[PDB]
Structures are given as C-alpha cells and as structure tokens.
Write an enzyme that holds these catalytic residues in place. Structure first.
Site, mmCIF file in Angstrom:
data_model
loop_
_atom_site.group_PDB
_atom_site.id
_atom_site.type_symbol
_atom_site.label_atom_id
_atom_site.label_comp_id
_atom_site.label_asym_id
_atom_site.label_seq_id
_atom_site.Cartn_x
_atom_site.Cartn_y
_atom_site.Cartn_z
ATOM 1 N N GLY A 1 -2.267 10.666 2.239
ATOM 2 C CA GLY A 1 -3.669 10.304 2.165
ATOM 3 C C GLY A 1 -4.043 9.149 3.067
ATOM 4 O O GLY A 1 -4.969 8.387 2.769
ATOM 5 N N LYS B 1 -6.984 11.941 5.575
ATOM 6 C CA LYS B 1 -8.379 11.524 5.708
ATOM 7 C C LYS B 1 -9.053 12.126 6.936
ATOM 8 O O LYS B 1 -10.277 12.306 6.945
ATOM 9 C CB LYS B 1 -8.469 10.000 5.768
ATOM 10 C CG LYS B 1 -8.301 9.308 4.428
ATOM 11 C CD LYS B 1 -9.590 9.347 3.623
ATOM 12 C CE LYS B 1 -9.542 8.358 2.466
ATOM 13 N NZ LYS B 1 -8.393 8.623 1.550
ATOM 14 N N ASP C 1 -12.596 7.707 -3.047
ATOM 15 C CA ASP C 1 -12.274 6.404 -2.475
ATOM 16 C C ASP C 1 -12.964 6.203 -1.129
ATOM 17 O O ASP C 1 -13.118 7.147 -0.345
ATOM 18 C CB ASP C 1 -10.760 6.242 -2.315
ATOM 19 C CG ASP C 1 -10.131 7.361 -1.506
ATOM 20 O OD1 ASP C 1 -10.414 8.545 -1.796
ATOM 21 O OD2 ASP C 1 -9.349 7.053 -0.579
ATOM 22 N N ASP C 2 -13.389 4.962 -0.876
ATOM 23 C CA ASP C 2 -13.952 4.537 0.409
ATOM 24 C C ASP C 2 -15.216 5.325 0.763
ATOM 25 O O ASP C 2 -15.295 5.999 1.790
ATOM 26 C CB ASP C 2 -12.914 4.650 1.530
ATOM 27 C CG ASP C 2 -11.685 3.802 1.281
ATOM 28 O OD1 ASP C 2 -11.779 2.810 0.524
ATOM 29 O OD2 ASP C 2 -10.622 4.129 1.850
ATOM 30 N N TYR D 1 -10.571 1.446 -7.147
ATOM 31 C CA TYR D 1 -9.185 1.837 -7.365
ATOM 32 C C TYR D 1 -8.217 0.659 -7.314
ATOM 33 O O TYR D 1 -7.003 0.873 -7.214
ATOM 34 C CB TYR D 1 -8.776 2.896 -6.339
ATOM 35 C CG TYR D 1 -9.050 2.481 -4.910
ATOM 36 C CD1 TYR D 1 -8.172 1.644 -4.229
ATOM 37 C CD2 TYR D 1 -10.189 2.919 -4.244
ATOM 38 C CE1 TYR D 1 -8.421 1.256 -2.924
ATOM 39 C CE2 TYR D 1 -10.446 2.537 -2.939
ATOM 40 C CZ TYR D 1 -9.557 1.704 -2.285
ATOM 41 O OH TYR D 1 -9.804 1.320 -0.986
ATOM 42 N N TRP E 1 -0.905 5.075 -7.267
ATOM 43 C CA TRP E 1 -0.940 5.395 -5.838
ATOM 44 C C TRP E 1 -0.478 4.130 -5.115
ATOM 45 O O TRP E 1 -1.233 3.159 -5.008
ATOM 46 C CB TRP E 1 -2.353 5.835 -5.438
ATOM 47 C CG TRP E 1 -2.669 6.049 -3.956
ATOM 48 C CD1 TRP E 1 -2.104 5.424 -2.879
ATOM 49 C CD2 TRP E 1 -3.666 6.935 -3.422
ATOM 50 N NE1 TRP E 1 -2.674 5.877 -1.713
ATOM 51 C CE2 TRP E 1 -3.637 6.803 -2.019
ATOM 52 C CE3 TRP E 1 -4.574 7.833 -3.995
ATOM 53 C CZ2 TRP E 1 -4.480 7.539 -1.179
ATOM 54 C CZ3 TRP E 1 -5.412 8.561 -3.163
ATOM 55 C CH2 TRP E 1 -5.359 8.409 -1.769
ATOM 56 N N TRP E 2 0.765 4.131 -4.633
ATOM 57 C CA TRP E 2 1.385 2.926 -4.076
ATOM 58 C C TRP E 2 1.323 2.960 -2.553
ATOM 59 O O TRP E 2 1.926 3.837 -1.923
ATOM 60 C CB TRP E 2 2.834 2.780 -4.543
ATOM 61 C CG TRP E 2 3.455 1.458 -4.153
ATOM 62 C CD1 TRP E 2 2.915 0.216 -4.329
ATOM 63 C CD2 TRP E 2 4.732 1.254 -3.524
ATOM 64 N NE1 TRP E 2 3.772 -0.746 -3.846
ATOM 65 C CE2 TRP E 2 4.896 -0.135 -3.355
ATOM 66 C CE3 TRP E 2 5.752 2.111 -3.095
ATOM 67 C CZ2 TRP E 2 6.037 -0.686 -2.770
ATOM 68 C CZ3 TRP E 2 6.883 1.561 -2.515
ATOM 69 C CH2 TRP E 2 7.015 0.176 -2.357
ATOM 70 N N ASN F 1 2.037 6.502 -0.597
ATOM 71 C CA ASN F 1 1.301 6.826 0.625
ATOM 72 C C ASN F 1 2.154 6.431 1.824
ATOM 73 O O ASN F 1 2.413 5.231 2.017
ATOM 74 C CB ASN F 1 -0.032 6.083 0.655
ATOM 75 C CG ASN F 1 -1.002 6.629 1.698
ATOM 76 O OD1 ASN F 1 -0.827 7.729 2.229
ATOM 77 N ND2 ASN F 1 -2.048 5.857 1.979
HETATM 78 C C1 LIG Z 1 -7.085 4.694 -2.313
HETATM 79 C C2 LIG Z 1 -6.705 4.295 -0.912
HETATM 80 O O1 LIG Z 1 -5.685 3.669 -0.651
HETATM 81 N N1 LIG Z 1 -7.611 4.690 0.083
HETATM 82 C C3 LIG Z 1 -7.349 4.370 1.487
HETATM 83 C C4 LIG Z 1 -7.194 2.878 1.726
HETATM 84 N N2 LIG Z 1 -8.287 2.247 2.053
HETATM 85 O O2 LIG Z 1 -8.316 0.953 1.725
HETATM 86 C C5 LIG Z 1 -9.172 0.314 2.585
HETATM 87 O O3 LIG Z 1 -8.753 -0.344 3.545
HETATM 88 N N3 LIG Z 1 -10.478 0.505 2.192
HETATM 89 C C6 LIG Z 1 -11.491 0.159 3.102
HETATM 90 C C7 LIG Z 1 -11.523 -1.129 3.615
HETATM 91 C C8 LIG Z 1 -12.534 -1.452 4.503
HETATM 92 C C9 LIG Z 1 -13.497 -0.515 4.851
HETATM 93 C C10 LIG Z 1 -13.458 0.767 4.317
HETATM 94 C C11 LIG Z 1 -12.459 1.120 3.433
HETATM 95 O O4 LIG Z 1 -5.992 2.228 1.706
HETATM 96 C C12 LIG Z 1 -4.890 2.948 2.210
HETATM 97 C C13 LIG Z 1 -4.092 1.989 3.119
HETATM 98 O O5 LIG Z 1 -4.842 1.770 4.271
HETATM 99 C C14 LIG Z 1 -5.407 4.143 3.055
HETATM 100 O O6 LIG Z 1 -4.343 4.884 3.563
HETATM 101 C C15 LIG Z 1 -6.066 5.064 1.994
HETATM 102 O O7 LIG Z 1 -6.509 6.256 2.552
HETATM 103 C C1 LIG Z 2 -8.318 2.689 14.377
HETATM 104 C C2 LIG Z 2 -9.634 3.137 13.757
HETATM 105 C C3 LIG Z 2 -9.598 2.858 12.261
HETATM 106 O O1 LIG Z 2 -9.401 1.754 11.875
HETATM 107 N N1 LIG Z 2 -9.791 3.933 11.309
HETATM 108 C C4 LIG Z 2 -9.731 3.570 9.909
HETATM 109 N N2 LIG Z 2 -10.811 3.685 9.141
HETATM 110 C C5 LIG Z 2 -10.765 3.347 7.857
HETATM 111 O O2 LIG Z 2 -11.898 3.470 7.049
HETATM 112 C C6 LIG Z 2 -12.845 4.388 7.513
HETATM 113 C C7 LIG Z 2 -13.967 4.459 6.481
HETATM 114 C C8 LIG Z 2 -9.548 2.850 7.305
HETATM 115 C C9 LIG Z 2 -9.445 2.470 5.937
HETATM 116 C C10 LIG Z 2 -8.234 1.991 5.442
HETATM 117 C C11 LIG Z 2 -7.125 1.878 6.281
HETATM 118 C C12 LIG Z 2 -7.225 2.246 7.617
HETATM 119 C C13 LIG Z 2 -8.466 2.739 8.125
HETATM 120 N N3 LIG Z 2 -8.586 3.106 9.433
#
Ligand SMILES: CC(=O)N[C@H]1/C(=N/OC(=O)Nc2ccccc2)O[C@H](CO)[C@@H](O)[C@@H]1O
Ligand SMILES: *CCC(=O)Nc1nc(OCC)c2ccccc2n1
Ligand SMILES: [Ca+2]
Length: 677
Positions: A132, A163, A239-240, A279, A334-335, A369
């Site tokens: 994810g 994603k 999420d997000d 979350y 979800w770790w 993850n």
């Molecule tokens: C539940 C969860 O962990 N969602 C995402 C997740 N998102 O967390 C964010 O960084 N959320 C976020 C922070 C700034 C802007 C938009 C989303 O954390 C993991 C580690 O990056 C991602 O792989 C996951 O897809």
């Molecule tokens: C390198 C481009 C990038 O940073 N893509 C990215 N987007 C998101 O959130 C999109 C809504 C993101 C969230 C958590 C961790 C990594 C992420 N990468």
C-alpha cells in the site's frame, strides 16, 4: 533454526533417516496443498504397504484418529511427531496441515530428521503483507515470488492496494480491470490459494466518492467483478483524503451495507477490512468523535486498521490500549516498515525491532507495508512472519541473520555486510530513525576525537577502519556478480556501486592520514577528488525518481567519518605547507554564505535555512525560478531583470531564455532554478 519458532518443541538427540520405503496414510483425505509438498520431499523413494508409516490428515480424518488428543484446539494449529517408528503430520484444519508440512521441510537436512514432537499454532490471527505504498507498484513476477515466500513462513494475508494503481484508487476505481490486468490478478489468486494465503483486494475511493446510490452500486459491481476473478477477501481504504469521504457515519454505513448485501450473501467470503481516515493517534482530532463513531456503528465482524501512535511508529501496550478502547475491538495493525516511499534514495535492510512482544491478544492482525523493491523487503517480511506467529520467543537479531541466509545462501555474509550499513533513513519529516554501523561506531568516534586535537589515535582503531573498507569492497564485487537471486541484485545495484566508491574513498583518505611525503599526499588528494565526482555521477543518473532521486548509502556513521577526516587532514596540510587546497566533501559543478548548492533532476537549488550569485557550468535554457520568504545573465556583465509574482511563494517564468548567471539584489527559505535537460 526453525522459523517461525513453534509454540511447543521437544527434541531427543536421536536422528532417523527419511524412509527409503514408506507407507502413506491419508494422502486422499488430507489437504491437497499439503500432500503435494509431502510427495516432493519423498520423491524417488518407494511407496508400498511395507515399511515406515507416515500419517497425514486433518482432525476428523480416519488417518489421524489415533492422534486427536495431541492436535491443538486452535485455528491453523497442528501436531508434528517424528520417531524411529512413524511420522505424524496432523493439523486442526486444512491450513494447519499445510503449515505442519512447512515446519517438516526445515527439519529435513541431509536426508535425515530429528526425533522430535511439536505442538504449534499462531498467536496472532492474521499475519502478512500490505502493498500500500506510493511509487512504482510491484511487478507481476515479483508478486508471484512474494506469495510463495509467505506460505513457507506461514503468512496468511496479502492485502493488495498500490496507491498508484488507477483501477484501485483515483480516478478509475469504478472501472473493471482491463483484460490483461484481470488475467494477471486471476493468476495471483490461484497462486495464493495454493500457498494458503488470503488475497485481500482493497479499494481507495474516498477522494471523489458521493454518498448516493450510484457510487454505492458501482463500488459493489466492482467488488462483484473482483469476485468473479477469484477474490474472496475485500478491503476499503479511506486514508489520505479530504472532503465528504471523511464522514465516519457514511463510512460505517457503507461497510455495513457491504457486509449485509455482499459478504453475508456469498458462501465463502473471509476477511472484510477498512482503513480509517484518522489512522494514528497524533493525527486524530481531540475535539472530535471519528473513532468512537466507527467503533459504535461498524459491525463487529469488520476490522479496523491502525499504524500506531504516529504514521511511522512502534506498537506498544499503551498505544494499542488507547485505540482498542475507542474502536471497541482489537486493532488490525498496519506497520509502516520497511516502506521507504518518503526516503526513496535509501535502502532499509536492517532488522525488525521495537514492537512489544506481549500484546498478541490485543491485535486482530499485523501487516507490514514494504518498499517498492520487493526482494529487498523479504528481510523485514521474514522477521514480521516470525514475530507475528510466536512473539513471546521473537529474537530480533537472530531472525535478521536467518532471513539473510534464506534469501541468499550463496553469499549471506556479503549481504549481511551490505545490510549492516544500509538501514538508517537519514533526516525525514517523520523523525523516524534506525540503528546503523553500530559495530564500528566506537572505534570510528575514538579515532576522530584524537585526530582533531593532535593526540595519537589507537593503531587498533585505524586498522579496524581499514578492515571495514576492505571487506566492504569484497561484498560489493561479490554481490554484483551473484546470479542466485538475479531480481535481488538488479534492485540493489545502484547502491552497490555507491557502496564500493564509499569504501575506495575511505581507503584513500586513511592514506592521506598516514601521509609520508608531500608528493604522495597530493596524489591521494587528487584521487579522492575523482572519487567524489564519480559519486556525484551515480547520484545524478541512477534511481532518478520524481521524489527523492539519487543513491545514498552508509550515511549514519561511515560517510560522516570519511568527510570529517578529509576536511581535517586537508586543513592540517594547508597550515603546514601554506597551501590552499579545497576541503569541500561533495562535488558540485556549479558555484556559489556557507549554504551548498544541490542538483536534483533539472533543478539547481540552495539548501534551505549590494548583495549576492549563482554561476552554472554552462549555458542552459531557463524554465522558472521559485523563492520563498532580480536579474539573470549569460556572460556576467550584461544582465536583465524579470519581476516575480507573489501568493512566501515568488515565481517567474524564464521562457527558454539562455542563462548562466543568476543574482538576487537591494529589494523588498527555498531558492530554486529549473532548467531544460
Ligand atoms: C495508512 C498509511 O500509511 N497511508 C499512507 C501513508 N501516508 O502517510 C502520509 O504521509 N500521509 C500524508 C502526509 C502528508 C500529505 C498527505 C498524506 O503512510 C505510508 C508511509 O508513507 C504510505 O505508504 C501509506 O500509503
Ligand atoms: C515523489 C512524489 C511524492 O511525494 N508522492 C507522494 N505522495 C503522497 O501523498 C499523495 C497524496 C505520499 C504520502 C505518503 C508517503 C509518500 C507520498 N508520496
Ligand atoms: Ca480432510
């Protein structure tokens, strides 16, 4: 060396040979997936009524009637026994019998077995992997290899939700997969069935979902399409996202509707899971009720996911009691490790640690993850398998090593040597760090203290750093030529080259310390300057992802030692021979405060925090400039002004004008120049 370690184990110090002639009982009534594994281990040997008896079956089959009191009364439990007279492989259910055969296979060594008795079962109900992350999704071949890896380590859950998959998330989550992608997912389901893994297919619709009957029906029709391809477990991720999709009342009603009209109407549906919008604890609302609303409204059979106290965090007893009291059920963890989609220039190959080992009763599931490099994630995935099955006996370091020796038996020491120095994350917005280079850190620090202040360093520490760099080059070269796991090597090759250059630079800097005469010193100095330029070139050509491009390695201890020692001995040289050598540690072709320029893709930036000027190594077409709190040139002297546009965020387009010099002077903290390449 059994992994995961059984719950009960009795060993005897007697060994028996795998029966050359045997007699199988229950081959027609036990789990076909288990029987297949069994006959692979027995192939070539003779089957008949004469000879040693082997009994396989589930509780209830005639084959194991004699042993029904030995079989644990637990889902996916089993009973294994080996002695001079017979072998017994008996699970509580069909999955228990399979897992019994997975332990059996490890026990077999050199055609011999130990006299042993095992009673085993898992402490955590659901254990596995959730794909994810953000970034390049796993290839189809990688996932095929993942699913076989899970069955060997008794992982029973694979949650699909990359994603960047448009049919999983925005924008086309309402559309069935195209024919090519559908047949591929149909093969994954078949393979995961053969390995006793639940294929959970998630969906991420919250960014543009509407709480009417059109979108509700479409989400169900997609679930039905996935059902026709084999899927029997399902998830909905929230999420997000922003907007109406964050409504806890509507979220719960949707999942309860999926339960009652889909999951309760089918004959064979297993897991039904959702991920909440809030979350983690740090991001939940104190002046709110999102989590208590879900806890009261969600049907009791539906799981709720949770990453812990923060987005990246370790799972404690305080943290899981905080969420369980609100959602009114045990949390489905979800770790977020070893996922690296926010530090894409690093490899995270260190051990799994930090999670409380006494809270197995307090969690419904546990999934990791991982990174977008699938084979590299096996180190941590193997450890989570061990942790989740038998946490009371979870040994961090011993599983890290056992994982490495399983992933690459032909060069395990070389890979452990590589992973030992590729485990920290570097500075990141989450402030999440890991240990790195701990064995050599003491001698590294003592050497640099004494060196900076005129005292003599211990010759043993100096030799320990020479021993390190030498072994680093051995592992890099051996790993690059290793054909036992070609996919693994392809993933790590850019870091393996940078690993080797780090080690070469280290040896040359230590020779500058020994420094006999002036001529030798300058020779080694010029070679270090060449190695720096070579590290820059790899950093700008390899893994040019749109987020954190480049390649970083050995960043916690080894790279700071080499840079600090180079800067120190160069300054001593300039003091002694009255010279003016450059002591900067990272090559940079452009020029000009002490903030160094950075090159990221086609950008040239100053590091964030009459007047000053930036000079490029050539003329390039200009794209834009961005500043946050006046002129350009091509030869230095003839300048021209362009004005900015504010909205903190000053922007201006250059529209392909030739540019080599950029200046800011006295008019009214990022600072980026984008050029064409
Ligand atoms: C539940 C969860 O962990 N969602 C995402 C997740 N998102 O967390 C964010 O960084 N959320 C976020 C922070 C700034 C802007 C938009 C989303 O954390 C993991 C580690 O990056 C991602 O792989 C996951 O897809
Ligand atoms: C390198 C481009 C990038 O940073 N893509 C990215 N987007 C998101 O959130 C999109 C809504 C993101 C969230 C958590 C961790 C990594 C992420 N990468
Ligand atoms: Ca049976």
């Amino acid at each position: 060396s059994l992994q995961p370690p059984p719950q009960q184990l009795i060993v005897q110090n007697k060994t028996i040979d795998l029966p050359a002639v045997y007699q199988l009982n229950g081959g027609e009534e036990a789990n076909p997936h288990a029987v297949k594994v069994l006959k692979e281990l027995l192939s070539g040997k003779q089957s008949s009524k004469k000879g040693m008896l082997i009994s396989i079956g589930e509780k209830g089959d005639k084959s194991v009637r004699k042993y029904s009191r030995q079989i644990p009364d637990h889902k996916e439990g089993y009973y294994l026994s080996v002695n001079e007279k017979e072998i017994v492989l008996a699970g509580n259910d069909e999955r228990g019998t399979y897992y019994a055969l997975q332990t059996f296979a490890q026990l077999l060594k050199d055609g011999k077995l130990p006299e042993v008795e095992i009673k085993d079962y898992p402490s955590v109900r659901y254990r596995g992997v959730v794909e994810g992350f953000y970034g390049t999704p796993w290839s189809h071949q990688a996932r095929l290899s993942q699913l076989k890896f899970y069955g060997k380590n008794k992982m029973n859950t694979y949650i699909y939700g990359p994603k960047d998959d448009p049919y999983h998330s925005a924008p086309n989550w309402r559309l069935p997969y195209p024919d090519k992608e559908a047949a591929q997912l149909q093969e994954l389901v078949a393979v995961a069935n053969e390995n006793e893994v639940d294929f959970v297919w998630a969906i991420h619709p919250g960014q543009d979902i509407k709480w009417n009957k059109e979108d509700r029906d479409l989400l169900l029709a997609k679930f039905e399409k996935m059902y026709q391809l084999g899927v029997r477990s399902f998830a909905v991720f929230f999420d997000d996202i922003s907007g109406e999709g964050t409504n806890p009342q509507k979220q719960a009603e949707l999942l309860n509707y999926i339960d009652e009209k889909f999951a309760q109407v089918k004959p064979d549906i297993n897991q039904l899971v959702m991920c909440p919008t809030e979350y983690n604890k740090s991001w939940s609302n104190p002046n709110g009720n999102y989590l208590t609303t879900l806890g009261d409204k969600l049907n009791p059979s539906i799981q709720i996911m949770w990453t812990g106290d923060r987005v990246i965090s370790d799972i404690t007893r305080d943290g899981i009691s905080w969420i369980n009291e609100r959602i009114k059920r045990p949390a489905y963890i979800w770790w977020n490790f070893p996922v690296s989609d926010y530090v894409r220039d690093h490899l995270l190959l260190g051990p799994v640690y930090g999670n409380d080992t006494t809270i197995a009763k307090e969690m419904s599931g546990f999934v990791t993850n991982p990174m977008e490099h699938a084979e590299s994630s096996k180190i941590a995935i193997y450890s989570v398998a061990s942790y989740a099955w038998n946490p009371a006996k979870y040994d961090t370091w011993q599983t890290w090593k056992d994982a490495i020796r399983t992933i690459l038996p032909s060069a395990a020491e070389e890979l452990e040597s590589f992973a030992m120095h590729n485990s920290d994350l570097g500075p990141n917005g989450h402030g999440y760090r890991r240990e790195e280079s701990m064995d050599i850190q003491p001698a590294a620090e003592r050497f640099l203290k004494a060196f900076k202040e005129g005292k003599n360093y211990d010759k043993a520490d100096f030799e320990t750093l020479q021993y390190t760099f030498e072994r680093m080059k051995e592992s890099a070269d051996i790993l690059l030529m290793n054909t036992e796991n070609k996919p693994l090597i392809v993933e790590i090759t850019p870091w393996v080259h940078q690993f080797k250059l780090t080690a070469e630079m280290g040896e040359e800097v230590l020779k500058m310390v020994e420094g006999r005469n002036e001529s030798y010193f300058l020779r080694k100095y010029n070679h270090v300057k060449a190695l720096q330029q070579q590290m820059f070139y790899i950093d700008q050509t390899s893994n040019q992802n749109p987020c954190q491009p480049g390649v970083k390695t050995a960043t916690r201890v080894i790279k700071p030692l080499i840079d600090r020692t180079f800067a120190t001995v160069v300054k001593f040289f300039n003091q002694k021979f009255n010279a003016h050598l450059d002591a900067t540690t990272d090559y940079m072709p452009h020029k000009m405060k002490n903030l160094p320029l950075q090159v990221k893709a086609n950008r040239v930036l100053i590091s964030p925090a009459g007047n000053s000027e930036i000079e490029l190594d050539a003329i390039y077409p200009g794209e834009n400039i961005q500043i946050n709190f006046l002129e350009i040139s091509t030869d230095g002297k003839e300048w021209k002004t362009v004005d900015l546009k504010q909205k903190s965020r000053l922007s201006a387009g250059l529209q392909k004008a030739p540019v080599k010099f950029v200046r800011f002077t006295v008019s009214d903290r990022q600072f980026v120049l984008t050029i064409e390449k």
